[PDB]
Amino acid sequence: SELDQLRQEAEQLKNQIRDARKACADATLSQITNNIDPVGRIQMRTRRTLRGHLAKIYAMHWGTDSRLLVSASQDGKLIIWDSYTTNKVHAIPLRSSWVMTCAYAPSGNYVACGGLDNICSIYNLKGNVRVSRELAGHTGYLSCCRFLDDNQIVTSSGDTTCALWDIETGQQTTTFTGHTGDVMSLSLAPDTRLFVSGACDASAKLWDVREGMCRQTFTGHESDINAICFFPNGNAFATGSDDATCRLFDLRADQELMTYSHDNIICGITSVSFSKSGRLLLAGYDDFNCNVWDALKADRAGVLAGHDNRVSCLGVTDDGMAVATGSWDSFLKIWN
Amino acid sequence: KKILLPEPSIRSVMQKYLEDRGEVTFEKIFSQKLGYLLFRDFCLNHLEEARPLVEFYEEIKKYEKLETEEERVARSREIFDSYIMKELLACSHPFSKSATEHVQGHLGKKQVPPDLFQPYIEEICQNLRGDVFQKFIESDKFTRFCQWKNVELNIHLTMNDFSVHRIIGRGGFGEVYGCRKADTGKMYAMKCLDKKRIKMKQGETLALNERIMLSLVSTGDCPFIVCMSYAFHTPDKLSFILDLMNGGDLHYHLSQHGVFSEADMRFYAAEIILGLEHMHNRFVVYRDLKPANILLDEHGHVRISDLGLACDFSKKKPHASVGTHGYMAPEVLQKGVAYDSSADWFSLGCMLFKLLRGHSPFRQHKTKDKHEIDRMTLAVELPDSFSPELRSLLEGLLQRDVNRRLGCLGRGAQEVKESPFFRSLDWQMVFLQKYPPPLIPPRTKGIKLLDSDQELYRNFPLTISERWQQEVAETVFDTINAETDRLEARKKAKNKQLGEDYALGKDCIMHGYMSKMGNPFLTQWQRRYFYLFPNRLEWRGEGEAPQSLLTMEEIQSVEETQIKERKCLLLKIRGGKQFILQCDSDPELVQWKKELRDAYREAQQLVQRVPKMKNKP
Amino acid sequence: ASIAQARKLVEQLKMEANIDRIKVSKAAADLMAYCEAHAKEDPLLTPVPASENPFRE
Ligand SMILES: COCc1noc(CNC(=O)c2cc([C@@H]3NC(=O)N[C@@H](C)[C@H]3C(=O)Nc3ccc4n[nH]cc4c3)ccc2F)n1
């Protein structure tokens, strides 16, 4: 049958892709970096504690100004914090209480959010604050969204797909099909021409925004991929998973480079981010702690212990000055 | 003391409460006394579209109450010209061809029965059942309806709610008092019946039956039966709130005035028949009809009272030998012989005879022998002084066999009205109490019970909706609406001083006032306004915003718990914590328990399917 | 199950298989080189003084 030789040819191509990757494993990232000096022990302290959320915090995102940050909470609100003074610039009551994610536009004029309502809502900040667009099209929950500019935005959903939206027309320009599980996170490449996504299928995918196609698929995790973040230079990305390990994947090499794990860590990872230089990889864990990893040597550099419930999100500012941590205990803390 | 209406914020909880029971339809709200007055108050004043529809309906109702044709002939034309002809000329007559022709046909032919505009009544409701009723719900007149419907479903009557007065009746199981309801000032009668003296005579069954019997007949406002408005009990007594009849019974007045002439006895017979027609239409045989059970009001009109021995024959016909000896039909005395309403028609003849001759038709030589009075029941020669019309009446009412008894021949009470003894009476004038009454009334121990004995009376408390609404409509309904209108308009006009609502524009499920428990040793109850969302329960004080909440995930179970004999809700939290809530009324508590249960069950089944929200190891 | 989607799976794997890869030793060097060029601009790696730290005050 032809269906047979299409399942068989897919196996023969999966083998061809595995062999082509092994042929590039002349060395490891740990062998290459055995000579550079360790980073020492990173000792950050809580600079700000953001109080104002009445329930679990689910997601946060930094503004380009490295000062303003937006957070989405179980209390059905978005709070845009002024991290320098802890004042609440804005407080947005949402039309739906099932919010899951939030994003800050590069220009700082709009914010986006969504969740089980299966809608990506754009909120104009420029004088009142009301919804300017409801982006409907997904048949599953909105897991993550990131602006390209004030006119385009990429989303990830529980319907196992991603999408690019035109904000003015509200249309679903292109869709990104390929995943076989709920897509849980997306990260845009610095040049905005590609983005990666992590799903519950335990695989990550590199997509072309313009071509709307999937270029590469990165497997290796044993469970759902909850978080994903691009390496500052756009040639690699990190992933957090329920298997209690973080993993670094290189694009030009097309495979995994490093696993950040420990027999002492059992719970899953909820968020990931890189320091401005990419040297440090921060990860939010389900054991209430955020672990700072050495991205190059894989050693555990530091720990951010200050939350009494799950750490559900984190993010490093563009200037790398501080790092934010959102928790199920309703607080956002700024470490530096 | 006085009725206090709940705040308009009650609309959120009551509307979902009524909608869950299909009580938010045009049929059910329009046919309620207070519902009609508010729906009318909405159309006539606050909606120019529905103003003529109600005035036409109301004019038809007034037309139905006209007494003579000369009054209908003069009104059927006004109603026709104003609400039929004038509309046809403007092409705005929103009715079918049948309704219009049916009325005009009877007009040009001068045949004007009181039911002339019935085909219009059916279509006036059809015109209101739709869009007008929907805008009515959206209006603030339906909010007030929810405010009134809340106080009705929160009625918990105790002895304190009544100002008890003098005694007006004694029996084997209790006394009847004249009382005044403090709520509305309505004068009632309170039949207080002793639970102790009940078990001592093993009359527990009859007690529950009378209240069941009073319920079957207390609808429709019958002017010739002593009907029930309320029923409640204490650990010791049972209380019936009945129509007040402070004129005594006929048994007493018969012994005072002596036998009544044929004309005086025709008055009581007419009004007693109409009362029987009320029961018989509702499948109730009184069985115990005698002068002692006929009460006079202050003017002399009479009602039948005490439905203890009455029973429903809608399903199965009674065969027991129940009643008072001397008034029981042959079918009744004969045990194992089912009977119908005929017993009352026979009892009527037995009673009416005694009103004329001073003794029951069978009680001979003033005998005190029970086995001889029932013997004669199974000829009964009538004196020569009885007129042929009266003689033929009792002759049909007292026939030994039911196949020939007057009133048991097919048409019911109509067969007794058509009797030539009542040929002079206009029964509409009897129903309207227009006839002059002939008589104007001038002005043990060593017994216990509990637990297993108080479960028999758990379904005893009751409230007749029609009775309570009719009581409120004719007392404080208008006065309370005016005081509540001025009181509500101040808070809003005054809130413009302070200042949007927290429930609009979101996915809020329900909101209202609740009292959450603080430190119990301090009787600390915090009255907060709660907001229930699909994933959390928020609450706040006045002026502030919700600063706390409780998530549906934290909630494990929702139970009902008694705290100081007040219905409260017990929410058990996952962290071994507990959360107690108290409501202002039962409908609020019933709704909060359902919604909270539905909210925590739907939210938890949903979270499990969201990998980012559910709990993991 | 469907024949149309099995073809689409083979075509996608073709696009993923016919790319230009580099040695992991090369990819690991570019990364290690990047971290050196910008390690001085990383306030988390190199502690900046309080006068330049917006959060210490
Ligand atoms: C819970 O069980 C109910 C029950 N079952 O059998 C019985 C037996 N009867 C009594 O016990 C009882 C009787 C009476 C008076 N005695 C009578 O021969 N006929 C009555 C009209 C009655 C009375 O006052 N009736 C009323 C009834 C309503 C009135 N409103 N205003 C004046 C009123 C008078 C008085 C008190 C009594 F307790 N009661």
- CATH number of the CATH domain containing B93: 1.10.167.10
Kindly report the CA angle at B599 between A224 and B562, in degrees rounded to 5? Answer: 130
CA distance linking residue B343 with residue B134, whole number of Å: 50
DSSP, collapsed to helix, strand or coil, labels residue B457 as coil
- Give me the sheet containing A162-166, strands edge to edge: A142-149, A152-157, A162-166, A171-176
CA distance linking residue C4 with residue B599, whole number of Å: 43
Residues of A in contact with B533 (CB under 8 A): 76, 97
Question: Are residues B281 and B430 located together in one domain of the fold?
Answer: yes
Q: Does C9 touch chain A (CB under 8 A)?
A: yes
Beta bridge partners of B304: B225, B294
Q: Tell me the CA–centroid distance for residue B168 and ligand 1, in Å.
A: 10
Nearest C-alpha neighbor of B137 from the set B36, B25, B7: B25
Question: Are residues B475 and B519 located together in one domain of the fold?
Answer: no
Beta carbons of B408 and B402 less than 8 angstroms apart: yes
The pairing of beta strand A46-50 with beta strand A57-62? unpaired
- For residue A119, how far is the Cα from the chain centroid? 19
CA distance linking residue B228 with residue B190, whole number of Å: 10
Nearest ligand 1 atom, CA B293: 21
Tokens of B370: 């029970």
Tokens of A335: 């470490």
Q: Tell me the CA–centroid distance for residue B430 and ligand 1, in Å.
A: 26
Whether the CA torsion B196, B200, B201, B202 is positive or negative: it is positive
Nearest C-alpha neighbor of B121 from the set B15, B31, B199: B31
Residue type, A215: R
B191 CB near ligand 1 (under 6 Å): yes
| Residue of C3, C15, C25 with shortest CB distance to A27 | C25
Residue type, A247: R
CA distance linking residue A289 with residue A294, whole number of Å: 16
Q: Tell me the CA–centroid distance for residue B307 and ligand 1, in Å.
A: 9
Residue type, B207: A
Beta bridge partners of B540: B529
Question: Are residues B275 and B410 located together in one domain of the fold?
Answer: yes
Beta carbons of A122 and A113 less than 8 angstroms apart: no
Between chain A and chain C, how many beta carbons pairs sit less than 8 Å apart? 160
CB pair distance less than 8 Å for A58 and B551: no
Domain assignment of residue A246, given as a range:
1-336
Helix-strand-coil split of chain B, %, nearest 5:
45, 15, 40
Which residue has the CA at smallest separation from atom 16 of ligand 1? Answer: B171
By annotation, the residues of B acting in catalysis are: 288
Residues of A in contact with B613 (CB under 8 A): 58, 100
Region label for B407, one of left (φ > 0), alpha (ψ between -120 and 50) or beta (otherwise)? left
- For residue B393, how far is the Cα from the chain centroid? 35
CA distance linking residue A174 with residue B541, whole number of Å: 48
Between chain A and chain B, how many beta carbons pairs sit less than 8 Å apart? 60
Tokens of B13: 């909880």
Whether the CA torsion B359, B364, B368, B373 is positive or negative: it is negative
Helix-strand-coil split of chain A, %, nearest 5:
5, 50, 45
Nearest C-alpha neighbor of B585 from the set B29, B21, B38, B17: B17
CA distance linking residue B532 with residue B94, whole number of Å: 44
Q: Does B605 touch chain A (CB under 8 A)?
A: no
Q: CB-hemisphere CA count at 13 Å for B203?
A: 18
CA distance linking residue A131 with residue B505, whole number of Å: 11
Tokens of C21: 């890869």
CA distance linking residue A250 with residue A260, whole number of Å: 15
Q: Does A134 touch chain B (CB under 8 A)?
A: no
CA distance linking residue B174 with residue B168, whole number of Å: 11
CA distance linking residue A107 with residue A90, whole number of Å: 16
Beta carbons of B163 and B175 less than 8 angstroms apart: no
The pairing of beta strand B228-233 with beta strand B187-194? unpaired
CA distance linking residue A174 with residue A194, whole number of Å: 13
CA distance linking residue A75 with residue A72, whole number of Å: 8
Residue B560 belongs to a domain with what CATH number?
2.30.29.30
Residue B475 belongs to a domain with what CATH number?
1.10.287.1270
| Residue of B507, B534, B547 with shortest CB distance to A95 | B507
Provide the number of structural domains found in chain B: 5
CA distance linking residue A40 with residue A299, whole number of Å: 10
Note whether residue B616 is domain-resident: no
Q: Tell me the CA–centroid distance for residue C27 and ligand 1, in Å.
A: 103
CA distance A19 to chain C (A): 10
- Tell me B85's DSSP state: I
The terminus-to-terminus CA distance of chain B in angstroms comes to 58
| Per-window interface: B 498-527 vs A, CB < 8 A | 505-507
Nearest C-alpha neighbor of A238 from the set A200, A282, A199: A282
Q: Does B534 touch chain A (CB under 8 A)?
A: yes
Note whether residue B86 is domain-resident: yes
Chain B neighbours (≥3 Cβ pairs under 8 A) are A
The pairing of beta strand A68-73 with beta strand A99-104? unpaired
Nearest C-alpha neighbor of B82 from the set B97, B68, B93: B93
Question: Are residues B528 and B471 located together in one domain of the fold?
Answer: no
Longest CA pairwise span in chain A (Å):
68
The terminus-to-terminus CA distance of chain C in angstroms comes to 64
- Tell me A244's DSSP state: S
Residue C30: Cβ-neighbour burial (10 angstroms; 0-12, 13-18, 19+): middle
B203 CB near ligand 1 (under 6 Å): yes
Question: Are residues B360 and B493 located together in one domain of the fold?
Answer: no
Beta carbons of B270 and B250 less than 8 angstroms apart: no
Domain assignment of residue B68, given as a range:
50-129
Kindly report the CA angle at B252 between B247 and B255, in degrees rounded to 5? Answer: 135
Q: Does B611 touch chain A (CB under 8 A)?
A: yes
Q: CB-hemisphere CA count at 13 Å for A128?
A: 4
- Angle of the B33-46 helix axis to the B51-64 helix axis, nearest 10: 130
Note whether residue B614 is domain-resident: no
Provide the number of structural domains found in chain A: 1
DSSP, collapsed to helix, strand or coil, labels residue B504 as coil
CA distance linking residue B158 with residue B183, whole number of Å: 12
Beta carbons of A39 and A53 less than 8 angstroms apart: no
Residue type, B23: E
Beta carbons of B306 and B216 less than 8 angstroms apart: no
Tokens of A188: 């845009």
CB pair distance less than 8 Å for A47 and C22: no
Give me the phi and psi of C43, to 5 degrees please: -55, -20
Beta carbons of A128 and A84 less than 8 angstroms apart: no
Q: CB-hemisphere CA count at 13 Å for B239?
A: 25
Residues of C in contact with A83 (CB under 8 A): 55
Beta carbons of A188 and A230 less than 8 angstroms apart: yes
Beta bridge partners of B68: none
Whether the CA torsion B32, B33, B34, B36 is positive or negative: it is positive
Q: Per-residue DSSP letters for C9-52?
A: HHHHHHHHHSS----HHHHHHHHHHHHHHSGGG-TTTSPPPGGG
Tokens of B539: 């609450």
| Per-window interface: B 545-584 vs A, CB < 8 A | 546-549, 551
CA distance linking residue A296 with residue A300, whole number of Å: 11
Task: Determine if residue B172 is labeled as part of a ligand binding site.
Answer: yes
Question: Are residues B496 and B507 located together in one domain of the fold?
Answer: no
Tokens of C10: 């083979």
CB pair distance less than 8 Å for A95 and B533: no
Give chain B's length. Answer: 617
| Domains, in order of start, for chain C | 1-57 (4.10.260.10)
Longest CA pairwise span in chain B (Å):
102
CB pair distance less than 8 Å for B535 and A242: no
B534-539: Cβ within 8 A, 24+ apart = B534/A97, B534/A98, B534/B507, B534/B509, B534/B599, B534/B602, B534/B603, B535/A74, B535/A76, B535/A97, B535/A98, B535/B603, B536/A54, B536/A55, B536/A74, B536/A75, B536/A76, B536/A97, B537/B596, B537/B599, B538/A54, B538/A75, B539/B514
Question: Are residues B279 and B199 located together in one domain of the fold?
Answer: no
Nearest C-alpha neighbor of B233 from the set B211, B206, B202, B218: B211
Tokens of B493: 């006009």
Residue type, B428: Q
Question: Are residues B292 and B428 located together in one domain of the fold?
Answer: yes
Kindly report the CA angle at A172 between A171 and A175, in degrees rounded to 5? Answer: 165
Question: Are residues B269 and B413 located together in one domain of the fold?
Answer: yes
Residues 6+ apart with CB under 8 A from B449: B195, B196, B199
Q: Does A268 touch chain B (CB under 8 A)?
A: yes
Residue B589: Cβ-neighbour burial (10 angstroms; 0-12, 13-18, 19+): buried
Nearest ligand 1 atom, CA B243: 30
Beta carbons of B197 and B174 less than 8 angstroms apart: yes
Residue B311 belongs to a domain with what CATH number?
1.10.510.10
Question: Are residues B407 and B262 located together in one domain of the fold?
Answer: yes
Q: Tell me the CA–centroid distance for residue B324 and ligand 1, in Å.
A: 14
Beta carbons of B243 and B227 less than 8 angstroms apart: yes
CA distance linking residue A279 with residue A29, whole number of Å: 13
Question: Quick count: other Cβ atoms within 10 Å of Cβ A67?
Answer: 19
Region label for B221, one of left (φ > 0), alpha (ψ between -120 and 50) or beta (otherwise)? left
Give me the phi and psi of B174, to 5 degrees please: 165, -170
Residues 6+ apart with CB under 8 A from C3: A2, A3, A6
Residue A278 belongs to a domain with what CATH number?
2.130.10.10
Beta carbons of B95 and B80 less than 8 angstroms apart: no
CA distance linking residue B416 with residue A6, whole number of Å: 95
Tokens of B232: 């409640």
Closest residue of A to B551, CA-based? A55
Note whether residue B528 is domain-resident: yes
The terminus-to-terminus CA distance of chain A in angstroms comes to 62
Q: Per-residue DSSP letters for B193-258?
A: EEHHHHHHTT-HHHHHHHHHHHHHHSSS--TTB--EEEEEE-SSEEEEEE---TT-BHHHHHHHH-
Longest CA pairwise span in chain C (Å):
66
CA distance A98 to chain C (A): 33
Beta carbons of A270 and B615 less than 8 angstroms apart: no
Residue type, B61: K
| Final resolution, Å | 2.7
Rg for chain B (alpha carbons), in Å? 30
Residue A60: Cβ-neighbour burial (10 angstroms; 0-12, 13-18, 19+): buried
CA distance linking residue A29 with residue A11, whole number of Å: 29
C and A make contact (3+ CB pairs below 8 Å): yes
Beta bridge partners of A119: A136
Give me the phi and psi of B330, to 5 degrees please: -55, -40
Give chain A's length. Answer: 336
Question: Are residues B288 and B431 located together in one domain of the fold?
Answer: yes
Tokens of A4: 């047979």
CA distance linking residue A68 with residue A65, whole number of Å: 7
